[PDB]
Scaffold this active site. Structure first.
Site, mmCIF file in Angstrom:
data_model
loop_
_atom_site.group_PDB
_atom_site.id
_atom_site.type_symbol
_atom_site.label_atom_id
_atom_site.label_comp_id
_atom_site.label_asym_id
_atom_site.label_seq_id
_atom_site.Cartn_x
_atom_site.Cartn_y
_atom_site.Cartn_z
ATOM 1 C CG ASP A 12 6.108 -3.104 5.754
ATOM 2 O OD1 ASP A 12 7.122 -2.869 5.071
ATOM 3 O OD2 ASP A 12 6.003 -4.103 6.490
ATOM 4 C CB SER A 13 2.098 -3.850 9.571
ATOM 5 O OG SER A 13 1.915 -4.814 8.581
#
Ligand SMILES: CCCCCCCCCCCCCCCCCC(=O)OC[C@H](COP(=O)(O)OCCN)OC(=O)CCCCCCCCCCCCCCCCC
Ligand SMILES: CCCCCCCCCCCCCCCCCC(=O)OC[C@H](COP(=O)(O)OCCN)OC(=O)CCCCCCCCCCCCCCCCC
Ligand SMILES: CCCCCCCCCCCCO[C@@H]1O[C@H](CO)[C@@H](O[C@H]2O[C@H](CO)[C@@H](O)[C@H](O)[C@H]2O)[C@H](O)[C@H]1O
Ligand SMILES: CCCCCCCCCCCCO[C@@H]1O[C@H](CO)[C@@H](O[C@H]2O[C@H](CO)[C@@H](O)[C@H](O)[C@H]2O)[C@H](O)[C@H]1O
Ligand SMILES: CCCCCCCCCCCCO[C@@H]1O[C@H](CO)[C@@H](O[C@H]2O[C@H](CO)[C@@H](O)[C@H](O)[C@H]2O)[C@H](O)[C@H]1O
Ligand SMILES: CCCCCCCCCCCCO[C@@H]1O[C@H](CO)[C@@H](O[C@H]2O[C@H](CO)[C@@H](O)[C@H](O)[C@H]2O)[C@H](O)[C@H]1O
Ligand SMILES: CCCCCCCCCCCCO[C@@H]1O[C@H](CO)[C@@H](O[C@H]2O[C@H](CO)[C@@H](O)[C@H](O)[C@H]2O)[C@H](O)[C@H]1O
Ligand SMILES: *C(=O)CCCCCCCCCCCCC
Lengths: 459, 120, 126, 56, 171, 155, 12, 79, 104, 84, 67, 170
Positions: free
Chosen positions: J39-40
């Protein structure tokens, strides 16, 4: 003085009868020769001044001013010949003729025995100077600069003419040697107060005194480089030389008449030093720096002590070389970027290494690094003003701090940091420009080895 | 420190004033008190060029040490015995100053104790 | 303890209440601001990258700044209560203050010399 | 006296020599930093002589 | 101008760097870097944006209170001890055009290759300008982004001062 | 540069305000001149009073050292806000609190130095004693006069 | 390898 | 050109990174960058002196030379 | 968050040019084309001492001996300390010893 | 004295020491989101690890675009004037 | 070079640097021990400090209360 | 070389070497090396230079100024007499400046020579400096930058008037 006046005059036929392409070579070579012979004026005696004739005399005050004057003419010619390249021949020779005529008026001004003769040559300098500014300046504002320069000077100088003519009627002579012996004290009366003001205001405007200085930042920002050099180096010192002579006949009234002008100068030097910190035009910054330095000279002349008169003489000579050098340094940048804005071209040390060295040396003399004659002059004034009143050290010391900040701010802004990306025409320093800077700094620093020759009669 | 608490916190009327002592006559309680003897003459300390603060009642030991130092060059580890003699003389000089403080302290205490007699 | 901004310590952006109220009107304003910057950036770059250009790319913004800081001031000056008081207080006030400081000091010193009470035993340089 | 004063002045004069050579008279930029370092080390030796005379 | 996601990710990176400045020791920092990641993870799936903005708003206030007054800065980053240190050695390429012919003679091969780069720049400029003209909306460019070369044999418009820029360690 | 592209007098009408904003390359909504007292600002924009240190150092500025872009309106006090001069950056401690602690620390130290001056530390000793009437001659006393004898006794 | 050092002209 | 040591050798066991992984395990968390720090706790970096050990560097040989130096001094002053 | 295809292509094209430019900064083998043990460590130190110590000390000593010290008060020395029991070279005078100390 | 292959070796070395990445499915072209499932927040940590590895900062504006190992190599090679 | 960089490993060392460092660390400790064997007074006290409260009233010249 | 009466120096008393060490004195050998390597070559060069000077002996003179009537004898406005009196006063002013400089040099030399005993041992020089500075201050202080014999005479007459007034009332 005929051995200097006549060869100076001969520079005019020399320039006009030269081959078209040798006007700069000939005029520069022979003005340097005249400067060489000027050293013969160093024959000074401990007691008597060098009194040539009924018209001209030279003493320890006028001698260093003469040698500076004759030294500057060749430097001015070198400084001018690049921006005048596209000018047609006759108009170049006219420009050189104005410079020669200014030198002629100046050497006669500094050696005139009679105060009225001094006045006429003192006033004749306006004409060539005004012509140089308004005819060969680049911007629209030169016409207004000429008018401010003209009428500030005449506003004070015409009252001086009346006072001098009045003095000759009362005393019988304006010969300076005569006045040394026939001088009488000045008594308190409203008549003498205005006699005092008429005798001093013309010189105060030329220094310039704080409050009467507005013409100066105009005149520099608009004058061509040679006009800036002689304006800063010599023409300001007409006022200082004028007071140093005329104060002889104003005592003891100067005891209290000096107070308003000492206050303007002591406060003015801090105001004009602070102004330099926020100037955006490099030529305008250097112009305001002159106002601050000459404030010390006014104070030194007004308090009339042997130490203050020696400091005033050294300061006038030292500022002449430093300030003229700074204008030449700023002009060399201007010939490349064609703008006087200080922040426009930065990091120039990366692009012009040797020129940055001239910038450093001019800055260090401007902030009076010991033992430069800049420091010697300023220190002698500091020593004498402390005896005048101990509190002046607060103002004099603060001004030393501010002078360092703006001297090095100018150095850091233009020489250091990162270069401007889009300014890609910064060509290498020419031999002419490097020689011009060395002919300022080298004599300036050499004088540190023998300061007595620029300390004036009180030495 | 101890003496400083007594003067600054306790009773300051019975503690010596370091800037005004002595305040009692030197012969008070001291019948026939001898004088301090000075071994080094004024001319000897003048030629030795002693620092004025060093021209005290121990100067004869300092002069002897200084001469040894010069004569033993380049051996800078010699004259330790002479240095100790001067140091020791200074120590006794300091102890004498400590006794002067204690003598004054006890006299001041005696005076107050006596001035209670004259009003009790 | 909330951040108290000052003249010389700005409010951090992360603590700005308005940095989170980004409405359609504000986003529109930001786009317009970027449009001007991009337009000026392109005008500059077309000269900056031009291989045949040697010299200085004159910036009107810089010219306007140096002009505003000098030539444009007097034409827009009006003598009113504000400028007169600041002019009087800052221009005249210090000169009067220093005149009395020095006049008072010098009057005292002169009086002492005239009574032989100022010590000038070795004072022979002035 | 004559040795003390001469050597104390030669210490100062020695330190200025690398500066004066920067006037390109006898100048070899190959190792100016070594030249300057050597000048300091020699000046240190010459300055110890008058120091010893003062200690003595 | 930064989206909500961009703001949250920038806060996470900034908070980890200040956390590392406090911890110093790697094992200690690893422990608290995981605890901090858990706090960001506890609200990762928040959907009500009003609630999420309030969380971000409060987190920035918590960061301000707990920031290191002297955080670690990479030496060459802005504010670092080596930031801009080598700028005085970066000389623009155009300075070489002003070299004396005897200076150029010392590097015949370098200056032959330089002459080819100037030829490439000259031959390419007009196409670069034309591409920018025909790809820019009528009002003007609305962002600072520049396009790539489209045709083969073309160069990306406005490339010279990026390609020929000074080296990071130019001496 | 033509006269129409140079700073002018204070803008009186909305058309002038829209014209001044255009000349300065600003949104008319962002353009605000200095208050029209007699101080000589004219129509020059009033921009945020922020140091150039506060600008993004990662943006590709036309003038990286100044953090200025070509053609953007310059702050009136730009030369005071260059990165070498006045910084307005946010501080980890509030300005007002910062002044209280610095002044408070200084005031406390000055007070305690007065206290320590009024109650000096010293050792329990009498005065140092010197021979020859407290070195009257060595200290420069007049040889032709006579000091009152200074006598030191043993203890 | 050895890399060319871009300097301003030192000849003048 | 440069040979990087094999990456599989970097393990958190036997290091204080293992202690952290156990503290985080109690809470249900995990430290995924642990092996990237392991090299700092292994090899020639494994054991470093305490502050007292740092100050006492060279004390063993300084003390040995001291005893010989004073032993010789007593021997000379004996004669 | 990631490069757009157009951004990817421009970076790729600029990347090729930049690497070609940096490769072009390498000097060729012939560039620059320039126009036309213990004992050797004693020599440099010997010549250096001669030109930087001996010659300057010859100049200074000559200057001090024959110009500076021929003028009054140019070199002033503190007079030597004289201790009890010393002999003066100039006169042959003998400074008497100090008195006999008390034992301490 | 960095090289293009030396940079790649160390960028992949750091990722092989990250517990959330299967070291066998890792290639220079793997997309941290589409290919590796991160994910980020994981992306931010990867960028921070690269800054520590090579000892310099990657600004958030640039950092958010590096989504595969090869882009990190290209970014680092560009900033450090690595052409081989 | 003569010392090649390593990746994630303890640096290569030379004998000269290790031996020279140890010798000067040992010289520091020999010097402290040697100096403290001869000059402990410089650390602990050169001379005894007396107790003023134990001086008799005779030697200080303190007369009895009735005098 | 210079007059010892003008620039006095007390007789020099150097102690004799009285070593109490068996180590050689490094200064003694260095002293011998200096005389051999530096003093002897320097003396030879000078002796050669003195030989050339001895071949070409010529003389210069100290200018002597006859006394002329001073400002007190000059009639008012008679520039011809005032000029000679003024020039003489200016010469005497320069001479008095150098007299003070000689006394200050004596004082400074004494302070360095006497070392730590200078306070007691330079009393005579400090007295002479004090008296000459007082006399110089009386003559020349406060005249201003535009000083002259006329102003100096005016200053003296003011001082004589004050001294007369104090004497009379006393
Ligand atoms: C003494 C100066 C008096 C200062 C007190 C204030 C004077 C004053 O209030 O003048 C106000 C007057 C106009 O007032 P106002 O009502 O505001 O006009 C707008 C109304 N629609 O304003 C005027 O029009 C009168 C102009 C007053 C002139 C002021 C002169 C002094 C200014 C300072 C000069 C600085 C001198 C510097 C000295 C040299 C060193 C720098
Ligand atoms: C007596 C008369 C005193 C006269 C004093 C004159 C003071 C002049 C005031 C400065 C004028 C501005 C000049 C421009 C200099 C400038 O703006 O530089 C800003 C500079 C920034 O410094 P920095 O914090 O390190 O930031 C760098 C990281 N970006 O910051 C600076 O470097 C400037 C800091 C100097 C500020 C003045 C401090 C004065 C302190 C006086 C109080 C102490 C009193 C004396 C000591 C006690 C005596 C026992
Ligand atoms: C009875 C009283 C009369 C007094 C007259 C005294 C002067 C007489 C001068 C006559 C000669 C004049 O000379 C004439 O003018 C100039 C100056 O030389 C010459 O041409 C000039 O060209 C340039 C300047 O433009 C210069 O190189 C140089 O001044 C000269 O060569 C002409 O080619 C010549 O024809
Ligand atoms: C700083 C350098 C300046 C360079 C100046 C260049 C121009 C030089 C001009 C030289 C002028 C010489 O002028 C002439 O010199 C000779 C010397 O031979 C002098 O000759 C005379 O000097 C003196 C005069 O008291 C006597 O010794 C004697 O009567 C005679 O020798 C003349 O009095 C003078 O008229
Ligand atoms: C930059 C601006 C500078 C401005 C400087 C202003 C200086 C002001 C100087 C004031 C002194 C003027 O001179 C002074 O005038 C007064 C008259 O008022 C004269 O007064 C004279 O007439 C009055 C009659 O009223 C008599 O009482 C007095 O005996 C007589 O001296 C004084 O003789 C003189 O001392
Ligand atoms: C060996 C060292 C010897 C010298 C030691 C000197 C220590 C002297 C310290 C004096 C400074 C104390 O300064 C004082 O700090 C406290 C702590 O915030 C402030 O306290 C105040 O501000 C804080 C924070 O805004 C708030 O909780 C509240 O408003 C109030 O407590 C005081 O407003 C301030 O006056
Ligand atoms: C008048 C006398 C003046 C002072 C003289 C003092 C002389 C002392 C000489 C000491 C020389 C010691 O030399 C050095 O000692 C250390 C002792 O740890 C050795 O070091 C040894 O222990 C350390 C760990 O403790 C490790 O490096 C390794 O286990 C081993 O090498 C070095 O391998 C050896 O090279
Ligand atoms: C006893 O021999 C004196 C030793 C000096 C002790 C110093 C005490 C320090 C106390 C703090 C000063 C506070 C200001 C009154």
């Amino acid at each position: 003085m005929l051995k200097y006046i006549i060869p100076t005059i001969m520079l005019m036929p020399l320039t006009w009868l030269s081959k078209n392409n040798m006007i700069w070579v000939n005029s520069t070579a022979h003005s340097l020769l005249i400067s060489f012979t000027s050293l013969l004026l160093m024959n000074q005696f401990g007691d008597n001044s060098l009194n040539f004739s009924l018209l001209f005399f030279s003493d320890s005050l006028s001698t260093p001013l003469l040698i500076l004057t004759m030294w500057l003419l060749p430097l001015m010619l070198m400084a001018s010949q690049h921006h005048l390249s596209k000018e047609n021949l006759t108009r170049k020779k006219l420009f050189i003729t104005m410079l020669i005529s200014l030198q002629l008026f100046l050497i006669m001004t500094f050696t005139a025995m009679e105060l009225i003769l001094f006045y006429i040559l003192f006033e004749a300098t306006l004409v060539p100077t005004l012509i140089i500014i308004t005819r060969w300046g680049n911007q629209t504002e030169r016409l207004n600069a000429g008018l401010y320069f003209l009428f500030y000077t005449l506003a004070g100088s015409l009252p001086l003419l009346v006072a001098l003519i009045y003095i000759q009627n009362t005393v019988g002579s304006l010969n300076f040697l005569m006045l040394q012996y026939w001088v009488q004290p000045v008594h308190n009366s409203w008549s003498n107060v205005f006699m005092w003001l008429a005798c001093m205001m013309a010189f105060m405007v030329k220094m310039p005194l704080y409050g009467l200085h507005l013409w100066l930042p105009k005149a520099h920002v608009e004058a061509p480089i040679a006009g800036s050099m002689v304006l800063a180096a010599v023409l300001l010192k007409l006022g200082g030389y004028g007071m140093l002579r005329i104060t002889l006949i104003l005592n003891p009234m100067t005891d209290f008449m000096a107070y308003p002008f000492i206050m303007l100068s002591l406060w003015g030097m801090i105001m004009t030093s602070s102004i330099c910190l926020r100037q955006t035009d490099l030529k305008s910054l250097i112009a305001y720096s002159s106002v601050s330095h000459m404030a010390l000279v006014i104070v030194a002349i007004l308090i009339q002590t042997p130490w203050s008169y020696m400091g005033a003489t050294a300061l006038m000579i030292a500022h002449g070389l430093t300030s003229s050098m700074l204008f030449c340094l700023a002009n060399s940048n201007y010939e490349r970027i064609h703008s006087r804005t200080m922040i426009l071209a930065r990091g120039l040390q990366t692009l012009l290494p040797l020129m940055a060295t001239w910038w450093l040396l001019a800055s260090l003399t401007n902030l009076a690094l010991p033992p430069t004659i800049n420091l010697i002059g300023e220190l002698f004034v500091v020593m004498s003003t402390f005896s005048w009143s101990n509190i002046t050290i607060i103002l004099m010391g603060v001004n030393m701090v501010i002078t360092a900040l703006y001297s090095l701010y100018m150095l850091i802004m233009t020489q250091r940091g990162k270069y401007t990306y889009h300014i890609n025409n910064i060509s290498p320093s020419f031999t002419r420009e490097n020689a011009l800077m060395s002919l300022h700094i080298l004599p300036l620093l050499l004088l540190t080895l023998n300061p007595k020759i620029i300390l004036g009669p009180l030495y | 420190g101890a003496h400083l608490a007594r003067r600054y916190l306790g009773d300051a009327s019975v503690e010596p004033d370091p800037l005004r002592m002595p305040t009692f006559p030197p012969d008070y309680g001291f019948p026939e008190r001898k004088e301090r003897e000075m071994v080094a003459t004024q001319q000897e300390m003048n030629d030795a060029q002693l620092v004025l603060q060093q021209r005290d009642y121990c100067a004869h030991y300092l002069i002897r040490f200084l001469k040894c130092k010069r004569d033993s060059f380049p051996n800078f580890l010699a004259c330790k015995h002479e240095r100790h003699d001067w140091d020791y003389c200074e120590h006794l000089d300091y102890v004498k100053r400590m006794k002067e403080f204690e003598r004054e302290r006890r006299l001041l205490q005696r005076k107050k104790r006596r001035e209670q007699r004259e009003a009790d | 303890p909330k951040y108290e901004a000052s003249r010389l310590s700005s409010l951090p952006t992360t603590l700005d209440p308005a940095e989170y109220d980004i409405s359609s009107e504000t986003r529109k304003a930001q786009a317009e601001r970027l449009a001007i910057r991009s337009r000026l950036k392109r005008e500059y770059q077309l000269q900056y990258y031009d291989p045949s250009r040697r010299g200085v790319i004159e910036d009107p913004a810089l010219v306007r700044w140096t002009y505003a800081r000098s030539a444009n001031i007097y034409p827009n000056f009006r003598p009113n209560t504000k400028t007169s008081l600041l002019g009087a207080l800052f221009g005249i006030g210090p000169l009067v203050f220093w005149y009395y400081v020095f006049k008072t000091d010098r009057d005292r010193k002169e009086k002492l010399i005239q009574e032989g009470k100022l010590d000038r035993t070795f004072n022979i340089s002035y | 006296m004559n040795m003390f004063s001469s050597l104390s002045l030669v210490t100062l004069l020695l330190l200025t020599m690398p500066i004066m050579m920067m006037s390109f008279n006898t100048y070899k930029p190959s190792n100016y930093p070594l030249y300057v370092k050597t000048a300091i080390s020699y000046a240190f030796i010459t300055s110890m002589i008058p120091t010893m005379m003062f200690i003595h | 101008y930064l989206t909500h996601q961009q703001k949250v990710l920038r806060l996470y990176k900034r908070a980890l760097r200040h956390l590392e400045s406090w911890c110093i020791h790697r094992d200690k920092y690893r422990y608290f870097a995981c605890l901090l990641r858990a706090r960001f993870d506890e609200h990762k799936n928040e959907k009500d944006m009003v609630k999420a903005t309030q969380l971000l708003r409060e987190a920035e206030e918590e960061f301000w209170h707990g920031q290191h007054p002297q955080p670690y800065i990479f030496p060459e980053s802005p504010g670092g001890t080596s930031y801009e240190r080598y700028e005085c050695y970066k000389v623009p390429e155009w300075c070489l055009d002003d070299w004396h012919p005897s200076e150029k003679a010392m590097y015949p091969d370098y200056f032959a290759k330089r002459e080819q780069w100037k030829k490439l720049r000259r031959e390419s400029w007009e196409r670069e300008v034309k591409q920018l003209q025909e790809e820019t909306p009528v009002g003007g460019p609305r962002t600072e982004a520049l396009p790539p070369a489209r045709k083969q044999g073309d160069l990306p418009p406005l490339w010279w001062h990026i390609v020929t820029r000074p080296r990071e360690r130019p001496m | 540069i033509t006269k129409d592209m140079l700073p002018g007098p204070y803008p009186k009408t909305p058309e002038e305000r829209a014209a001044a904003a255009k000349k300065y390359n600003m949104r008319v909504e962002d353009y605000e001149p200095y208050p029209d007292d007699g101080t000589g600002y004219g129509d020059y924009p009033k921009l945020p009073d922020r140091s150039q240190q506060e600008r993004d150092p990662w943006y590709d500025w036309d003038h990286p050292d100044l953090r200025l872009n070509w053609g953007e309106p310059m702050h009136w006090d730009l030369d005071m806000y260059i990165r070498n001069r006045v910084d307005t950056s946010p501080t980890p401690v509030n300005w007002n609190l910062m002044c209280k602690h610095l002044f408070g620390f200084v005031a406390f130290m000055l007070f305690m130095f007065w206290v320590g001056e009024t109650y000096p530390a010293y050792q329990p000793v009498g005065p140092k004693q010197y021979p020859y009437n407290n070195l009257y001659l060595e200290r420069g006393g007049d040889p032709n006069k006579e000091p009152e004898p200074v006598v030191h006794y043993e203890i | 390898k050895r890399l060319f050092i871009i300097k301003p002209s030192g000849f003048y | 050109k440069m040979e990087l040591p094999d990456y599989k050798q970097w393990k958190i066991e036997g290091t204080p990174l293992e202690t952290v992984q156990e503290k985080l395990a109690a809470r249900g968390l995990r430290d995924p960058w642990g092996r990237n720090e392991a090299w700092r706790y292994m090899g020639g970096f494994a054991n470093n002196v305490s502050f007292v050990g740092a100050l006492l560097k060279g004390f063993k040989w300084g003390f040995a030379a001291f005893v010989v130096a004073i032993g010789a001094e007593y021997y000379l002053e004996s004669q | 968050s990631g490069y757009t295809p157009e951004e990817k292509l421009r970076l790729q094209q600029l990347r090729e040019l930049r690497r070609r430019w940096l490769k072009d900064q390498e000097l060729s083998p012939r560039e620059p084309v320039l126009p036309p043990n213990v004992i050797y460590k004693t020599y440099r130190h010997s010549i250096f001492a001669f030109t930087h110590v001996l010659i300057p000390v010859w100049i200074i000593h000559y200057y001090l001996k024959y110009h500076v010290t021929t003028k009054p008060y140019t070199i002033v020395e503190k007079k030597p300390r004289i201790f009890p029991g010393d002999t003066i070279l100039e006169t042959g005078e003998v400074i008497p010893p100090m008195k006999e100390f008390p034992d301490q | 004295p960095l090289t293009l292959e030396g940079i790649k070796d160390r960028v992949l070395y750091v990722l092989k020491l990250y517990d959330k990445i299967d070291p066998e499915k890792l290639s220079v072209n793997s997309h941290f989101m589409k290919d590796l499932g991160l994910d980020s927040l994981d992306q931010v940590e990867i960028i921070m690890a690269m800054e520590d590895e090579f000892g310099f900062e990657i600004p958030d504006i640039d950092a958010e675009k590096l989504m595969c190992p090869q882009e990190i190599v290209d970014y680092i090679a560009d900033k450090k004037d690595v052409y081989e | 070079a003569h010392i090649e960089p390593r990746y994630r490993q303890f640096p290569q060392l030379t004998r000269s640097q290790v031996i020279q460092a140890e010798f000067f660390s040992a010289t520091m400790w020999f010097w402290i021990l040697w100096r403290f064997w001869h000059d402990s007074d410089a650390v602990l006290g050169h001379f005894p400090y007396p107790d003023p409260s134990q001086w008799t009233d005779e030697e200080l010249g303190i007369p009895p209360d009735d005098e | 070389s210079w007059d010892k009466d003008v620039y006095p120096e007390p007789p020099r008393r150097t102690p004799a070497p009285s070593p109490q060490t068996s180590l050689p004195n490094p200064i003694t050998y260095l002293t011998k090396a200096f005389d051999l390597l530096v003093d002897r070559p320097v003396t030879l060069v000078r002796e050669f230079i003195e030989r050339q000077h001895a071949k070409n002996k010529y003389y210069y003179y100290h200018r002597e100024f006859r006394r002329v009537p001073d400002i007190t004898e000059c009639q008012e406005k008679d520039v011809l007499c005032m000029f000679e009196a003024e020039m003489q006063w200016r010469r005497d002013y320069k001479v008095d400046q150098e007299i003070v400089n000689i006394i200050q040099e004596r004082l400074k030399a004494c302070q360095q020579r006497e070392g730590e005993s200078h306070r007691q041992n330079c009393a005579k020089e400090l007295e002479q400096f004090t008296q000459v500075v007082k006399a110089y201050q009386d003559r020349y202080h406060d005249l201003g930058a535009h000083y002259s014999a006329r102003k100096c005479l005016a200053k003296q007459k003011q001082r004589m008037l004050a001294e007369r007034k104090a004497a009379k009332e006393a």
